[PDB]
Amino acid sequence: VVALRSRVIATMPGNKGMASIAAPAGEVRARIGDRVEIAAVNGPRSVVVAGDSDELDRLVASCTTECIRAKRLAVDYASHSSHVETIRDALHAELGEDFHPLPGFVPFFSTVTGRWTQPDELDAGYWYRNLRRTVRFADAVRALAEQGYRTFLEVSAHPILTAAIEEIGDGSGADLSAIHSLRRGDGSLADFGEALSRAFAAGVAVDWESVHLGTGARRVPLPTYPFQRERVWLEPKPVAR
Amino acid sequence: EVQLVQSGGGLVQPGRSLRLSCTASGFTFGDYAMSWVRQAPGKGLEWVGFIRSKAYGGTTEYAASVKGRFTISRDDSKSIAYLQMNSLKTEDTAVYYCTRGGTLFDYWGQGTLVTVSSASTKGPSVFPLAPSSAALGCLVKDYFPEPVTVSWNSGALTSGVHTFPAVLQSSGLYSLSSVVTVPSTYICNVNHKPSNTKVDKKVEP
Amino acid sequence: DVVMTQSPLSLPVTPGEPASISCRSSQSLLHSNGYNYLDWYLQKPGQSPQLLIYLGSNRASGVPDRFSGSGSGTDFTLKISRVEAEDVGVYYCMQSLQTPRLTFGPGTKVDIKRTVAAPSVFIFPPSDEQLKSGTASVVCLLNNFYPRGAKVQWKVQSGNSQESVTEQDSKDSTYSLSSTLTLSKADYEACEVTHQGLSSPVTKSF
Numbered sequence A: 001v002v003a004l005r006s007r008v009i010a011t012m013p014g015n016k017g018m019a020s021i022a023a024p025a026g027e028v029r030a031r032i033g034d035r036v037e038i039a040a041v042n043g044p045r046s047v048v049v050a051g052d053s054d055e056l057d058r059l060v061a062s063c064t065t066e067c068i069r070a071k072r073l074a075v076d077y078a079s080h081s082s083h084v085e086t087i088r089d090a091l092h093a094e095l096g097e098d099f100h101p102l103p104g105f106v107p108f109f110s111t112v113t114g115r116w117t118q119p120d121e122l123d124a125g126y127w128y129r130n131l132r133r134t135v136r137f138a139d140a141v142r143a144l145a146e147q148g149y150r151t152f153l154e155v156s157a158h159p160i161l162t163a164a165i166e167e168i169g170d171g172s173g174a175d176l177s178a179i180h181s182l183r184r185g186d187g188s189l190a191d192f193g194e195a196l197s198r199a200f201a202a203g204v205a206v207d208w209e210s211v212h213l214g215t216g217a218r219r220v221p222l223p224t225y226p227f228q229r230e231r232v233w234l235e236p237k238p239v240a241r
Numbered sequence B: 001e002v003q004l005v006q007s008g009g010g011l012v013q014p015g016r017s018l019r020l021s022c023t024a025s026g027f028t029f030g031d032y033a034m035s036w037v038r039q040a041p042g043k044g045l046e047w048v049g050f051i052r053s054k055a056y057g058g059t060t061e062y063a064a065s066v067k068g069r070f071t072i073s074r075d076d077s078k079s080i081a082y083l084q085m086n087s088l089k090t091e092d093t094a095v096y097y098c099t100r101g102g103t104l105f106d107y108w109g110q111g112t113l114v115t116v117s118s119a120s121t122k123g124p125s126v127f128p129l130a131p132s133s134a135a136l137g138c139l140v141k142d143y144f145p146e147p148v149t150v151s152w153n154s155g156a157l158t159s160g161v162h163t164f165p166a167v168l169q170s171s172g173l174y175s176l177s178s179v180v181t182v183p184s185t186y187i188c189n190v191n192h193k194p195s196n197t198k199v200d201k202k203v204e205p
Numbered sequence C: 001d002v003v004m005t006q007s008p009l010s011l012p013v014t015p016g017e018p019a020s021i022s023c024r025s026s027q028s029l030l031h032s033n034g035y036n037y038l039d040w041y042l043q044k045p046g047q048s049p050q051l052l053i054y055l056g057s058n059r060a061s062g063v064p065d066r067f068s069g070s071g072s073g074t075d076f077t078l079k080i081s082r083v084e085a086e087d088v089g090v091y092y093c094m095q096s097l098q099t100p101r102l103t104f105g106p107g108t109k110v111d112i113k114r115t116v117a118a119p120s121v122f123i124f125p126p127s128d129e130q131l132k133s134g135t136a137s138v139v140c141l142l143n144n145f146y147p148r149g150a151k152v153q154w155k156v157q158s159g160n161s162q163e164s165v166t167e168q169d170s171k172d173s174t175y176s177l178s179s180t181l182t183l184s185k186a187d188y189e190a191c192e193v194t195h196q197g198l199s200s201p202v203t204k205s206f
Helices: A002-009 A025-031 A090-094 A124-132 A137-146 A189-202 C128-133
Strands: A019-021 A036-043 A046-051 B003-007 B010-012 B017-025 B035-038 B046-051 B060-062 B070-075 B080-086 B094-099 B112-116 B135-139 B150-152 B177-181 B186-192 B197-203 C019-025 C038-043 C049-054 C067-071 C075-080 C090-095 C122-124 C136-145 C152-154 C175-183 C191-193
Touching (some): A002 A090, A025 A036, A090 A124, B017 B094, B046 B080, B060 B070, B135 B186, B135 C136, B177 B186, C019 C038, C019 C090, C049 C067, C128 C136, C136 C152, C136 C191, C152 C175
Antiparallel strands (some): A019 A046, B017 B080, B035 B046, B035 B094, B046 B060, B094 B112, B150 B186, C019 C075, C038 C049, C038 C090, C067 C075, C122 C136, C152 C191
16 A cells, blocks of 8 residues: 555655644644645644645745744655545555455544544545545544543654644643654664653553563562551550549 | 474375374373374364384384375484375365374374365455345355455454355365345455455345 | 274253263173273364273373263263363264274264254355356355254255355354355256254245
């Protein structure tokens, strides 16, 4: 799916690109114009934008006059728009020919719908829904918090979205955790271990009986729990005579 | 523990040479007389043969069905029993076991599925079963070899789903007919793993 | 000659209830040592056969105490004191007096016991694209029946029917039959059962 999608999509560059800003959805949805639309709300203070060139470059520059994280996506391409919708064969069905929708299993989370769905719609239609509709990722993160989900692990090589998952909780009462992913410039196991640590810290259940199987380690006497002792005594009540 | 773990199954055309190995760990290999019991798909067990202990001579007793074709050996220093299956024909499609006793079969090992078929790897010919007026099903005729797996509504419906054990034609092919029973408009996706040919089926009366 | 050993081939068991498989040998399996030479094996559905009893009454180690053993020289018996959900499968009565033994016997087809069911005869005429394909498969699926002793005919005769049956399910504990009449181009131009879930022949055709 991803290989064929990227392969064909390599031709639309030169007409439209992509951007990812952490501006509040209000001002940008107000000032968007000239074939410019929001590809994915990823928070109350985060919106990915899919708009044409020479206005999407000045949309992150309409974000350098405001001084926000300025990243003119070097992987710029066409998506969530019409320039990719015209391909109703290669970019709509050729990517995903075979598919086996899964049942309940462990609840996954689709975004183009804004709610949890059974993983039975996950196919070339979904990639058609990532090229036709928006992503409404923020709506699904609110639904995650509603279904009891708070620690968010960013599967990537740099925090761009957990950074934005913390603007999910910059205005939400359910302040949520967003473990800092390997920094831009980190690519070694020393930095992965540092992440596993802050994952445990944030609350991510780590099966430590899996990290220590290849190490061939041993268990050695360590100090027990330091119970912080109060003074709880109920004294026999009375005073003689 | 005693574990008679086996190895050496696979797919061949009638008239080949196939090796069946029985790794014995847990007991003194030389005291017992390992034997090989065949179980053709879905029928009773038939005993192929057995080698006597090295101290009991090592005389190998085979069946009437496979005399002059199969030969059984054993090694203590490498601690393996062998079923050497030569000149196979269509009958050897079966789950061959390795028990640790000539008259007293014991551990039995695990079950090495050996298949002797003249067919080739082809995907399913998914043919639907239209309801009379009821249940809704779909064939998977003419696929080979087994594995095979059929779901309904792509693994959404699991109640009423009966994936009939597969069936061998005289041509060497396989035929599953998976059917759900529910009043209604349902989908069946068959994935022939050896060839990776996933075919999908929408059915109406 | 050879020892011919038979058993109650289709014995039903209901969980928590003592059951009893029996074996009957033509010749005498009580060898001079006073030790019977009959063995009881269990092949649990889709697993390696197990040794339950050797020498008629002795139980193999690692085998649940439930399986008890007894018998004279001809008639023999396996008394499962408590049948649970693992006590089901095929119980082979397998002699030891005359080795070699080309077969393990038909084996006692054990099933989790319920009352009689109702075979859901469902004649499914072959999809016509199949006739466009070069074959014909009218399928007479019987569904949800127990016990599994159903004749399934093909008239209007039979002889081109091939058999497909699953083992007993859990929550319904029934059986299902896929009698396929694979078939050829022209001769396409009825199925019924005699299962004891009913008595009268129920004939529905394509």
